[PDB]
Every structure is written in structure tokens, then in C-alpha cells.
Amino acid sequence: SLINARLIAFEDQWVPALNAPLKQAILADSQDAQLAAAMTYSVLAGGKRLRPLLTVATMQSLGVTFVPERHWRPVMALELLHTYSLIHDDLPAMDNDALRRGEPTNHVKFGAGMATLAGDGLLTLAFQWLTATDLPATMQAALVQALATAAGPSGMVAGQAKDIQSEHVNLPLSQLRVLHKEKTGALLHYAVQAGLILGQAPEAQWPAYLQFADAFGLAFQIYDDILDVVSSADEAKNTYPGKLGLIGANQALIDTIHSGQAALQGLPTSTQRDDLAAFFSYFDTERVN
Amino acid sequence: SLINARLIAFEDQWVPALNAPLKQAILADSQDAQLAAAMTYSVLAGGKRLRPLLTVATMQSLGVTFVPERHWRPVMALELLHTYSLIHDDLPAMDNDALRRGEPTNHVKFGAGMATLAGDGLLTLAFQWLTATDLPATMQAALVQALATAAGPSGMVAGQAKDIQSEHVNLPLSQLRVLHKEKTGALLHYAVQAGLILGQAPEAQWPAYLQFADAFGLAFQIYDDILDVVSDADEAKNTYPGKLGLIGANQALIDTIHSGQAALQGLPTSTQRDDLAAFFSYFDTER
Ligand code: DMA
Ligand code: DMA
Ligand code: DMA
Ligand code: DMA
Ligand SMILES: [Mg+2]
Ligand SMILES: [Mg+2]
Ligand SMILES: [Mg+2]
Ligand SMILES: [Mg+2]
């Protein structure tokens, strides 16, 4: 399948705009040079910025204008948190990886101690950024509650815990779904949820947007599993192609994409919702072939 | 002695009360039993709870009584974050310690990976707990901003980064002071600031409360340095006894206690003065 021209236009506008203030902001909110450099290193090493892009596309789809002085820190808090999860995931105690985002991993460059602290620093800074701007306190509190719920011991960290415990266990698919929903699903759910909070989405619209979000999070993970096989064994077993075969994984991807599209078709049509729908064109459903 | 009995009586009442809902609360907020066990193990292994005790003492000195439905999760959020910091500090990549709070460290019991996640889980859960009750949103947001500022890369974590970077380095005292204010001062400053927030302290009283908070946090560190040195050469040099000798360190402790007592004198009522002053009795006995 092909990437939608809408999505190309959207990322060309937003990726550089979201990225530009990162280095100055992280440094401004730090009181240690090396810590600042370590946190920034992992954030700037690369990244599709899928999570904050989703937040912005959600906001736009609610007719709400992104204002950098009000919205940039809260939106990019999610990217700080996502980046922290990657630093800790690569650590010697965890996955013990040498490369991340095409660069040496944080601990290889700074030491395992400083890498651990860079992760802790980014996790914490995320909550400072959610509450750093002139947004209503009700909206700030809702963001914090949502992010902590998505990121913590019922969400991303629970998923990471399950991953430790499943390292040499061939999981049934039903159990793998629960793991995925915590480990990767929850921050993608939050990405959209944050846009609903910032855009003050009427309550009646929440189910359709969040069904879209959950479907996007599931498609993301199935595609990541597919990419692990096609692109450049016991943990390969706990993947969609590991459970279902490559064709079966790709059928799951196709079904999930359609399910998310169907969810959004519940809301009134608009060009901005067409932009949001177009995020599914990130997933090439012909990559298996 | 009398003042010491006052502090001990406060702790005997409040520590069991504050601890009681912890196991059930952490479990309710988790979706992995092993993770919950690892988080709960380090929180319940012990701890003087000085940080949430300071919050309670501050709020009640301002005339706001502790209400469990409103206040328990937000107050104990500070203790979850404090506990996270200890777990990560003990890790093989950091201090590589075998015992914490009278028990084997988290990574000895659960492994380094799960201990790292237990710290991450506690840090994140702290922010959920701050915003978990139905306190006014202005208060919730103020607590989150204050805690993240105290705990993050300008506060605690920055203090920890300076500690890594000074492992085999003889720091000048002026640098050591900055390191201390970040590493241990910041969360103790927050302990009192959280009480000002929850107690809706009048704005003119903030300076006296926070001068007290800073003196307490400074004294806490000097006392910790003193006790470490009493109970190789690279370890001891970046401490108060290392810089000033044990006599000078003790003189610094005594002067800092007096400064904190002086700060409290600027509060408008005797009841406020006496409530927080009992915390300096902590230094009058041994651990
Ligand atoms: C499974 C998982 C969470 C992978 C990293 O996420 P990503 O593919 O969005 O990475 P990046 O942030 O590097 O684009
Ligand atoms: C929350 C998080 C960072 C998950 C990454 O999981 P993984 O180790 O399966 O993916 P990757 O190959 O990106 O490390
Ligand atoms: C240097 C430092 C922050 C030590 C632990 O503080 P603490 O003595 O308050 O620990 P506990 O929570 O075990 O009472
Ligand atoms: C924030 C934090 C946990 C600091 C620990 O300092 P330390 O390692 O000197 O104290 P301890 O002797 O309690 O590990
Ligand atoms: Mg990994
Ligand atoms: Mg992993
Ligand atoms: Mg230590
Ligand atoms: Mg240490």
C-alpha cells in the first residue's frame, strides 16, 4: 500500500516544527550539563514522532489551533516519556542493546548509571512539561492523570514487566494481546486522549476517537512485529508472525486498519479527520510480499 | 527530650496510619503482580516517612486537617517517589548496594531489570496519586509542577548526576553545596511546599516555611554525612566531615538547626512555631 499525500504534507509541516525547540527546552530545564546532554542525545538521535504527531492531528481534527507557547511542552512531554522508555529498555539489565535510533545507545555513550538517570530525568520532565504552560488547571490535571495511567504500573511499565517475565515463554496470542496493549498500546491511546483533552472534545466523541486510537496502537505493534521479520528466536516467538505466520500477521494488520477507519467514520467527515485517518497509511500492507 | 517526645508521639500516631493503605493501594493501581510485589517490597521494607510527615505537619499547622479520601494519595505520592530514588540509587550501575531499609535491596530480590521497572513504576505512580483524588485542580497541578521540578533534571536527578560525576573527584565545598541542595534538599523543600499547597498557606508565610524547609534539608544531609563517616578515601572526601573535619561538620549541623529554628520564629503564631520545630529533634537522637 501507499502513504497518503495528506500524511506526507502533515509530517512535513509538523515534524520539524515539533523538533526545533527540543534542545533549548531540555537544556533550560536542566541544572547539569552532562545530564542535559544525555537526555537530549536520545531525544534527538531520531524518531518518527508518531505519538506527538497523533496528538496534534487529534487537536486539528477538533478545530483547535496548536499554539506553541501553550501546547508545545504538553504535547512533547509524551515524546520525552517515550524516549525514556527506550533508554531504559536498552539498558544492560533489560535488552542490553548497542544501537537505538541509528546511534550508539545511551549507556554505551554515557555509562549505564548516567543512562538510567537520563531516563529518570526524561520521565520526570514529562510531568513538568504537562504543567509548565498557561492551560486551565483542570486540563493540566487531566493530562497528568491520563499520562501517568498510560505510562505506569497498569500501562507501559506493566507491559515492560510482562515482557521480562515472558522472555523464554511462548505466550498464547490472547496473553500477547494484553502485553501489547500495556507495553505499546497505552501510550498510543494516550497520544489521542491528550488531543481530546487539549482540544476539549465533547464527551460523545470520545468513544470513536479512542477506538481509533486503540486500533492505531494495535496496528503499530503488528507492523513493528512484521518489520522485525522482513527488515534489517524465543522473543521472535512472541510476535504476530510468530503466532500466526506472516500472512496471518498481515491479515491482522489489514483488519485492524479497517477497524480504526470504521471507528472514525462514526464522527462527522472533515478534511482534518481525513488527515487523522491517513495515519494508517504509515503501515505498508504489502511489505510481507 | 520534651520536644523529642512530641516528635516521637507525632510519628507513633501518623506513620502506622499513613502506611496502612499502601499495599492495597499499590496493588489496585497495578496490572502486573510481580511488578506490584517489587514496588511494594521497597516501600514497605521500612522508612522513617519524614517527607510525608513534614507535609502533614505543615498542612495541619495551617489549619487544614488531613482527610484520607482527599489527602492520603497526594501526600504519600512523595513517599513513592522517594522510594523510587532509593531503588535506582542502589542498582548495580549506580551504588551497587546489597541492603536498603534493613532488607536485601530490590535488585537482589527481584533482579536488576525488574528493580529498574519498580523504580520507574513508583515514579510514574506518584504523579497518578497526586491527581487521583478530587482536590481542586489548581492544587493538583501545583503539586505536580512542584514535585516534578524538585525530582527532575534541575532537582533530585541532577543531584544524582553530579554524584556520579564526582565519584573520584575532590569537589570544592561550593559545588558540594549545590549537589546537596539538588540531591536531598529539593524533595525536603517539596515536603513542606506540598503542605503549603494543601494548606492554602497565606503568601507572606511562604518564606519562613521554606527557609525552615531548606535548613531542615541541609541539616538532614550534614547529619547523614556525619553518621556515614562515623559508622575508601574517595567516598569520604565529598562529605561535610571531609571538607570541614568532624568538628566543623558538627558546628555546621548545629548552626543550620539554629537557622531553621530562627526561620520558624517569623511565623505569626506559637502553634505554627512549635509544630515544625519538633522535627529538629530528629538530630538529637541516633538512627
Ligand atoms: C515497540 C516500540 C515502543 C518501539 C519504539 O517505538 P517507535 O517505533 O515509535 O520508535 P521511534 O520513537 O524511534 O520512532
Ligand atoms: C516500552 C518499550 C520501549 C517497548 C520496546 O519493546 P521491544 O524491546 O520489544 O522493542 P525494541 O525492539 O524497539 O527495543
Ligand atoms: C541520602 C538519602 C536521601 C537517604 C535516604 O533518606 P532517608 O534517611 O529519609 O531514608 P528512609 O526513607 O529509609 O527513612
Ligand atoms: C536521592 C538519593 C537516593 C540519594 C542517595 O544518596 P546516597 O547514595 O549517598 O545515600 P544512601 O547512603 O542512603 O544510599
Ligand atoms: Mg528493546
Ligand atoms: Mg524490550
Ligand atoms: Mg546510595
Ligand atoms: Mg548514591
CB within 8 Å of B195: residues ≥ 6 apart: B54, B55, B56, B57, B58, B59, B61, B62, B201, B209
Distance CA B169, CA B13 (A): 44
Q: Is the dihedral of CA A235, A238, A244, A247 positive or negative?
A: negative
Quickly tell me which residue has 517515550 as its cell: A82
**Helices A137-151 and A68-90 sit at what angle, rounded to 10 degrees?**
20
Distances (CA, A) of A121 to A80, A103, B31: 9, 20, 24
Residue A55: CB partners within 8 Å, gap ≥ 6? A75, A78, A191, A192, A194, A195, A198
* CB of B95 shorter than 6 A to ligand 4: yes
Taking the CA atoms of B234, B236, B240 and B243 in sequence, report the sign of the dihedral they define.
negative
| Contact criterion met (CB below 8 Å) for A264 and A273 | yes
Which chain A residues have a beta carbon less than 8 Å from that of B137?
Answer: 136-138, 140-141
User: Could you tell me the CA-to-CA distances from A96 to A99, B94, B113, B161, B171 in Å, in that order?
Assistant: 9, 16, 10, 21, 33
Domain A1-289 has CATH 1.10.600.10: yes
In this structure, chain B runs to a length of 287
CA separation for the pair B254, B189 (Å, rounded): 19
Residue B132 has phi, psi (to 5 degrees) of -85, -20
Alpha-carbon gap, residue A52 to A220, rounded angstroms: 15
Separation CA A67–CA A246 (nearest Å) = 43
A chain contacts of residue B111, beta-carbon cutoff 8 Å? 93, 164
CA distance B196 to B108: 38
Q: Is A82 in the pocket of ligand 2 (CB under 6 A)?
A: no
With contacts defined as CB-CB under 8 Å, which chain B residues touch A94? Answer: 113, 116
Query: Which ligand is in closest contact with the Cα of B48?
Result: 3
CB contact, 8 Å: A185 with chain B? no
The answer to whether residues B268 and B205 touch, using CB atoms and an 8 Å cutoff, is yes
Report the C-alpha gap between A25 and A27 in whole angstroms. 5
Binding residue per annotation — B255?
A: no
Which of A93, A136, A153 lies closest to B32 in CB terms?
Answer: A153
Report how many Cβ contacts below 8 Å link chain A to chain B.
185
How far apart (Å, rounded) are the C-alpha atoms in residues A153 and A158?
A: 5
Burial status of residue A223 (CB atoms within 10 A of its CB: 0-12, 13-18, 19 or more): buried
Of all protein residues, the one whose alpha carbon is nearest to atom 12 of ligand 2 is: A228
d(CA A14, CA A288): 29
Does A163 carry a binding-site annotation?
A: yes
All three cell numbers of A216, joined, read: 492505531
Whether residue B183 has its Cβ less than 6 Å from ligand 4: yes
A151 vs B contacts (CB less than 8 Å): 124
Give the binding-site residues of ligand 1, using a 6 Å CB cut-off. A 46-48, 50, 82, 101, 184, 224
In SS3 terms, chain A reads as: CCCCHHHHHHHHHHHHHHHCCHHHHHHHCCCCHHHHHHHHHHHHCCCCCHHHHHHHHHHHHCCCCCCHHHHHHHHHHHHHHHHHHHHHHHCCCCCCCCEECCEECHHHHHCHHHHHHHHHHHHHHHHHHHCCCCCCHHHHHHHHHHHHHHHCCCCHHHHHHHHHHCCCCCCCHHHHHHHHHHHHHHHHHHHHHHHHHHCCCCHHHHHHHHHHHHHHHHHHHHHHHHHHHHCCCCCCCCCHHHHHCHHHHHHHHHHHHHHHHHHHCCCCCCHHHHHHHHHHHHCCCCCCC
Architecture of domain B1-287: Orthogonal Bundle (1.10)
Cα(B176) to centroid of ligand 3, in Å? 18
Q: Which of B50, B180, B218 gets mutated to test ligand 3 (max ligand atoms within 8 A of its CB)?
A: B50
Contact A120 B123 (CB under 8 A): yes
Number of neighbours of residue A289 by Cβ within 10 angstroms: 9
Q: What angle do CA B184, B260, B266 make, to 5 degrees?
A: 135
Q: Closest ligand 4 atom, CA of B156?
A: 1
Output the CA angle B115-B116-B122, nearest 5 degrees. Answer: 85
Which residues are within 8 A (CB) of B9 and not within 5 positions of it... i.e. 6 or more apart?
none
Local structure of residue B103 (DSSP, 8 states): E
B100 beta partners: B103
DSSP structure class, residue B185: I
CA distance B264 to A177: 56
Q: Coil, strand or helix: which one is B95? A: coil
In this structure, which long-range contacts are made by residues A9-15, counting pairs with CB atoms below 8 Å and at least 24 apart in sequence? A10/A53, A10/A57, A10/A275, A10/A278, A11/A53, A14/A49, A14/A53, A14/A56, A15/A49, A15/A53
d(CA A28, CA A5): 37
Give, as one character, the DSSP assignment of residue B104. E
* Residues in chain A, overall count: 289
Q: How many Å from the N-terminal Cα to the C-terminal Cα in chain A?
A: 11
As a whole number of angstroms, the distance between CA A272 and CA A216 comes to 17
Instruction: For residue A45, give the nearest of A124, A100, A122 by alpha carbon.
Output: A100
**Residue owning the nearest CA to atom 5 of ligand 3:** B86
| Ligand 4 contact, B88 CB (< 6 A) | no
**Rounded Cα gap, residues B49 and B14, in angstroms:** 9
Using the atom order of ligand 4, give the atom closest to the CA of residue B159: 1
CA-based nearest distance A7→chain B, Å: 33
Q: How many angstroms separate the CA atoms of A64 and A278, rounded?
A: 19
Reference B192, options B59, B101, B6; nearest CA is B59
Written as nine digits, the cell of A95 is: 535488552
Q: Is B163 annotated as a binding residue?
A: yes
Give residue limits of the domains in chain B.
1-287
**Nine cell digits for residue B45:** 521494607
What is the resolution of the experimental data for this entry, in Å?
A: 1.8
Give the Cα separation of B121 and A158 in Å (integer): 8
Which of B61, B23, B39 has the alpha carbon at shortest distance from B196?
B61
Q: From the CA of A221, how far away is ligand 1's center (Å)? A: 9
Contact A157 B121 (CB under 8 A): yes
Partners of B103 in the beta sheet? Answer: B100
Instruction: Answer whether A116 touches B (CB < 8 Å).
Output: yes
With a 6 A CB cut-off, is A250 part of the ligand 2 pocket?
no
Any bridge partners for residue B104, and if so which? B99
Using most ligand atoms within 8 A of CB, pick from A11, A44, A49, A50 the residue to mutate for ligand 1. A50
Kind of pairing, strands A103-104 and A99-100?
antiparallel
Q: Which atom of ligand 2 is nearest to the CA of A86?
A: 3
